[PDB]
Design a protein around this nucleic acid. Sequence first.
RNA 1: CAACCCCGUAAAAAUACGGGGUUCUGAAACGCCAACGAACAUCAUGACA
RNA 2: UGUCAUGAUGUUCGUUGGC
Length: 750
Amino acid sequence: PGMDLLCLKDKLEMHYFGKTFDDNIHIQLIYQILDIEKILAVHVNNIVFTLDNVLHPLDYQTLRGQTNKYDRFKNYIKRKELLYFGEAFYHENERRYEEDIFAILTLLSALAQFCFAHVNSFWLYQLEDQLSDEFKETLSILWEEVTERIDSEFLKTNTVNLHILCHVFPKESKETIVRAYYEFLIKKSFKNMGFSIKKLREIMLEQSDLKSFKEDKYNSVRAKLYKLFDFIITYYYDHHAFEKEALVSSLRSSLTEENKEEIYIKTARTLASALGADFKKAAADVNAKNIRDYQKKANDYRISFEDIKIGNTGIGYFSELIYMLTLLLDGKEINDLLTTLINKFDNIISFIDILKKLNLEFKFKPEYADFFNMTNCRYTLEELRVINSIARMQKPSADARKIMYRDALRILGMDNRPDEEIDRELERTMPVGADGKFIKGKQGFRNFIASNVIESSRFHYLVRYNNPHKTRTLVKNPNVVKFVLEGIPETQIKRYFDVCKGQEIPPTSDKSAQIDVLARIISSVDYKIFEDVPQSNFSDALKKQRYQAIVSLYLTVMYLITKNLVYVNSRYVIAFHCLERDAFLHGVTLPKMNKKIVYSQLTTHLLTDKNYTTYGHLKNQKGHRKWYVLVKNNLQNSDITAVSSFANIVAAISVVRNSNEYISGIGELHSYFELYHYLVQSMIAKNNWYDTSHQPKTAEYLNNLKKHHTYCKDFVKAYCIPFGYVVPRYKNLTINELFDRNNPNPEPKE
RNA sequence: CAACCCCGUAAAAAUACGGGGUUCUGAAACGCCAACGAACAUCAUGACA
RNA sequence: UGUCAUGAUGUUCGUUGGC
Ligand SMILES: [Mg+2]
């Protein structure tokens, strides 16, 4: 009755709650708690790698007494490439105090030590009684800085709709409209109702009362109309209250889907007859004149609402930590981290409701009781919502731009040269003159680099994750370049080809013809071509666009390789994190031999267990013995040293770092899976991370790689055997067709 | 695209084939990616007391 | 130096195609 395949129901229930239950609602609740740590660990590992790449290697009172850790801290905090991170260590063009930087580094180290599994196992869930009083101030200062920013910035960028809403509602204070509308979009009070207001709006639109807004001229404003109807709806339920309560009971007591549709149609039609005039009044006030007039007077409302906001309210110690992680990430990574966490906490709250409704036990153990209860899980959700809804520009400062000029020219030529030659070329191209000024009328190279390289999101990704000294080798191999261009959709390629065409090639519609032409342009690019850009005539206009297209194509190719190789490494970090978590509960410790770790001990133990072999993934029955044999077959082809060496590569991300010594001998590519594994097998080759005495089969694996210049499929099935106890994960990480969920190829026939 | 469990007709194997399940299995799907749009903030351009 | 036009770079919502 609800027993899981991994055979860990009772252990998890007794670890979290305190006893065993005959129901299938608690274990699904526990898996979400298990899930959040995975993404948290992935991103912590990424941040640590970036910090170690950019910066080459009691309380604060003890720090000075050490005289050795103090010496390292004095220079590490003085190392002046900290400017690459926007607001982590520099605010208002001045360096933060040493204590705050020490606090951030120590907190990052503690979180990294917690996830990759000294600190207790309860650290993340009880921070109130474990955090020192000195570390409770650093988080407060950082959040006080942003709470003043959001207050002044929220009362703008939408000062068109909010004026009309207050005009519709006369008998309400200036506070009330702002409070309700802030509760509407900043933190979604619209989300936590069982109604479908968007569907209800469509059903009302089927009525002639408010479908008179379907004119073609209404296309000038669409988004600022759908939102307005929603807020009017959500306040209508708020004032009625009892009517909303009755509708909930009626919907919950529905028999079939036809009854639900009839009630929704009846509910929609009576709403139109209820406040149809109100709907008409708001929608008739929108036009070009009023929008421009209201935008002119954007300071007619003065509401502070400082008391409500979590900047002054006692924001939790857990949500402040997430904000600290946000300062060390970019726009794309923030969305992935926060959106996953919101989904996790939404589902946790719902499960507790089911347990309460059905009259079942829901209290946790005394250790988890403080954090995991119904009220706290609500509060921690809107705090995660308000963090995600912050506008970020991430401009490249004003002092950090001097360093960025040095690196920008290193990508485009003079890779691995002394800093003396870098400065001379900067002086030679764009001069300074007298009194440290800038020579007017003779400077167009700086504006080109500043507005197309320094202020680009692709460029920041490369500097953080890759070394600009050795980044040029990524575009020297035609096979790698050709594959990346094929991934770009067809619509972009046609645009790029026409602009970068030149005057020596004819127009051709063959996609393969265009790719080869673009490959030669990208291969040979130097900054010396960009020394004649029109300063401040259709010839000048065409030449400016042509130069812009080439540099964007240059960085796009490099940015995709780095991003996708990191993604593949992130998939294997999750796999190793689950092994340590699962081996602890089963009672199986991972031993050592010759200062190594046998990562294949768990799968050996589970191959000879009666319960797992009968009620688990690896099954031994007449008709269900396929994957029991294959894993047992593939176990006898594994090297202890090779598994240990692979674990170190995954943890430290050595594929991205040492990719310039092996990407010059690749044969032919078809997916990012092949490129990642070719590099991994290459390192094991020359570094001699194997042993043919204990397994004479690794010898033939390495011979196939060199004579074919492509990865060997059998060899990846050997060192991934520590994941053999979970069949779906073993298949996904060892067969290329099942790796990416965007490939419809079938599993190869054996 | 794969794993797991029910009910079917042949069968005893690393079991094929036809219907339904699965937050208690793994893949970012409340997610990513392109082209057209309405706002807004940046930077380089002509008209002026 | 404030304003009006003018083309470029990037966030934010929404319509439509593809995963
Ligand atoms: Mg799951």
